[PDB]
Design a protein around this ligand. Structure first.
Ligand SMILES: Cn1cc(-c2ccc(Nc3ccc(C#N)c(NC4CCCCC4)n3)cc2OCC#N)cn1
Length: 258
């Protein structure tokens, strides 16, 4: 319940949304009694490369404000040699929290979320950015609308730390815009089938080996949504060159037909 100031404006802390090493996201309230999210970054122990990775993500979030409504709103920020405070839109819940909370998701809710994820990821691709690490936790639900929280440029946990379930097969070998297609593909597979394509594999060394194994058939069960099975099968292709692009996903019958 301790107060804080961002560019001369007062924000009293209400709760703590998440934590990241050297970082903390809090639910706050300003003097006009509106509700915001404030990301606090502790810069004290951080190198010049880390610092520049943080300054790079801020600038992109600041720029990509204008280009898409599928990117988290950044209202203001205070930057010192000591800390970063970023005043963002609060939203309802992250996509991981929502998917973990409810058992089954509505087929319509799924298309809307998909359209939103493609639009978000497309905007960063349009600027030279590949997130390279997409998980439902990177997306925020803001009044039925999914928004991309970050660009995986800056070096979190709600209080998926280093997940492999949404990892592309080229990342296990090692990154191109096609990597984000694999990751988005896994999120959809989770929204369609209730688990990631390789979720069932208890071991991480056995899971890592499965993603890169082409003779390890990924199942694609029969569902009423025929177009959806095709989106899934098109995204989860091991060769990046044989995997569908975002411009092509945005003109797929799934996202476009009533
Ligand atoms: C029941 N429940 C609600 C949440 C939640 C989760 C996230 C947010 N909003 C934001 C707004 C900005 C950021 C940033 N940066 C962020 N990050 C979190 C960090 C922890 C992992 C999920 C994303 N979350 C708001 C959230 O609730 C509304 C508020 N305050 C999680 N569980």
């Amino acid at each position: 319940f301790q107060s804080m100031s961002v560019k001369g404006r007062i924000y009293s802390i209400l709760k703590q949304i998440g934590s990241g090493g050297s970082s903390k996201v809090f639910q706050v309230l300003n003097e006009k009694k509106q509700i915001y999210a404030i990301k606090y970054v502790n810069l004290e122990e951080a190198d010049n490369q880390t610092l520049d990775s943080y300054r790079n993500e801020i600038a992109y979030l600041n720029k990509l404000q204008q280009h898409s409504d599928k990117i988290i709103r950044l209202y203001d920020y205070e930057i010192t040699d000591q800390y970063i405070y970023m005043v963002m839109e609060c939203g309802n819940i992250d996509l991981n929290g929502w998917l973990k909370k409810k058992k089954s998701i509505d087929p319509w809710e799924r298309k809307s979320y998909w359209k939103n994820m493609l639009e978000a990821v497309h905007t960063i691709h349009q600027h030279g950015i590949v997130h390279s690490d997409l998980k439902p936790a990177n997306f925020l639900i803001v009044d039925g609308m999914l928004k991309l929280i970050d660009f995986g440029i800056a070096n979190m946990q709600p209080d998926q730390v280093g997940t492999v379930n949404y990892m592309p097969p080229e990342a296990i070998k090692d990154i191109s815009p096609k990597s984000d297609v694999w990751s988005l593909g896994c999120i959809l597979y989770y929204m369609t089938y209730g688990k990631t394509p390789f979720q069932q594999i208890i071991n991480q060394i056995s899971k890592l080996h499965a993603i890169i194994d082409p003779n390890h058939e990924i199942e694609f069960p029969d569902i009423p949504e025929k177009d959806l099975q095709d989106v899934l099968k098109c995204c989860l292709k091991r060769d990046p060159k044989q995997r569908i692009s975002i411009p092509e996903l945005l003109a797929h019958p799934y996202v476009q037909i009533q």
